[PDB]
């Protein structure tokens, strides 16, 4: 026996049943361009996560409002949706969880929030800035653009202290240029 065999893993996305439908291709490309995604799989995994959350919410809506599992798991689901900024305060019911779209999840990415915070000129500039290790959430630098930012962590998105845009020293391009000068 190898102990490593017991580590779990799973798939994060599915491919569409119809590969070449014009309407779906246009909608996916519109979302990808709006949020600077690297491929369709990044949107497909968000759709996969939304599908699992929606299935959970629907299954508790098909149970009584006194069923102790619906009180408990619906409270947990609402806490998770409020924690990541996916739901407002007035939207405090399991019904509103069913109304969530992949747009709501894509709007909470570190790339989208870095772009909307003014730190980057474009969504693609935000993507490169995050992948260049210039962005920290709290004290932790995050080089992963699909990072889902909590509302309590939104106000702590900032330039890295080791980055030239965050008080750090100049990068190798600038330093080499001044050394040439």
């Amino acid at each position: 026996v190898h102990v490593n065999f017991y580590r779990n893993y799973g798939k994060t996305f599915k491919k569409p049943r119809r590969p070449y439908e014009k309407e779906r291709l246009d909608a996916e490309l519109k979302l990808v361009g709006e949020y600077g995604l690297r491929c369709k799989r990044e949107l497909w995994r968000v759709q996969y996560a939304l599908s699992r959350i929606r299935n959970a919410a629907r299954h508790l809506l098909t149970l009584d409002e006194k069923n102790p599992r619906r009180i408990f798991e619906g409270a947990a689901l609402l806490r998770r949706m409020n924690r990541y900024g996916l739901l407002a305060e007035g939207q405090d019911k399991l019904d509103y969880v069913l109304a969530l779209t992949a747009e709501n999840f894509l709007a909470r990415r570190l790339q989208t929030l870095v772009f909307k915070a003014g730190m980057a000129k474009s969504i693609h500039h935000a993507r490169v800035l995050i992948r260049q290790r210039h962005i920290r959430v709290g004290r932790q630098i995050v080089n992963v653009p699909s990072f889902m930012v909590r509302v309590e962590s939104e106000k702590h998105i900032d330039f890295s202290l080791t980055s030239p845009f965050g008080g750090g020293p100049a990068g190798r391009v600038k330093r080499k240029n001044q050394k040439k000068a």
Binding site: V1, V3, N4, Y6, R7, P68, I71, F72, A75, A76
Partner: protein, 260 residues
């Protein structure tokens, strides 16, 4: 197989040990002893996983070979010694004494006890019958044989045993209205008073227990352990006081603690 198994695969270990899935291929197989393998907490687990005194298997060996650990007043050097319910674990160097009780989630918890309270354990009488020479003798579920027991003591009774003198100093008759702790099943660690005993000829006997807050639960006779005469247990209980909480109330407690 052609004989006894010497190894316990880690996946096949008791779930109340809370052993992690990727810590290795193996779990400590409990040695034979006073308690059953599936219902005990081995000494190595207590020393390394629970008390954090040792960090490795070898460190547990080093601690135990120093003769630092006494189980129910006696020095044990076996790491897989099957310490079980109500056992006294004493370390007479740091001056700390532990009674192995169950929390309401079915997991053994080392409960700190006073020096005087570590001088006795509670044992459950398994059977009373005549031994050789016609001498009456008592046996318990923790493997002890006591000769010349009080004739008023019957099977399923709880006796109070003084570890220093090794005699029955007091006992409790298994009656309706005595506070009990469930030691097996899904209600393990729950504390309540017996309301009635439903007997069925030829099969297991069902005990109906109601806790202090009013919740009612039922369990077999083999999973009931009397801990006090009346509504006052003879030992101290862990923080939960044997009152199981639903996950909603646990979430309420967590929310209140986070808010504070």
């Amino acid at each position: 197989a052609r004989g006894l198994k010497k190894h316990l695969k880690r996946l096949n270990a008791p779930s109340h040990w809370m052993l992690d899935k990727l810590g290795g291929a193996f779990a400590p197989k409990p040695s034979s002893g006073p308690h059953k393998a599936r219902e005990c907490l081995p000494l190595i687990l207590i020393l390394r996983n629970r008390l954090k005194y040792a960090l490795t298997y070898r460190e547990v060996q080093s601690i135990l070979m120093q003769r630092h650990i006494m189980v129910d007043g006696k020095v044990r050097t076996d790491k897989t010694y099957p310490a079980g319910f109500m056992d006294i674990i004493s370390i007479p160097k740091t001056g700390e004494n532990y009674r192995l009780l169950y929390d309401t989630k079915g997991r053994f918890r080392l409960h700190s006890v006073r020096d005087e309270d570590a001088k006795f354990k509670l044992c459950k009488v398994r059977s009373v019958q005549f031994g050789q020479k016609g001498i009456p003798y008592l046996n318990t579920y923790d493997g002890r044989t006591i000769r010349y027991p009080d004739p008023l003591i019957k099977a399923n009774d709880t006796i109070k045993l003084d570890l220093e003198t090794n005699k029955i100093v007091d006992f409790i008759k298994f009656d309706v209205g005595n506070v009990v702790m469930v030691t097996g099943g899904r209600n393990t660690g729950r504390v309540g008073v017996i309301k009635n005993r439903e007997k069925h000829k030829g099969t297991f006997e069902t005990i109906h227990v109601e806790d202090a807050q009013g919740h009612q639960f039922a369990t077999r006779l083999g999973n009931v352990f009397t801990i006090g005469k009346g509504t006052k247990p003879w030992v101290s209980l862990p923080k939960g006081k044997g009152i199981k909480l639903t996950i909603i109330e646990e979430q309420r407690k967590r929310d209140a603690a986070a808010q504070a």
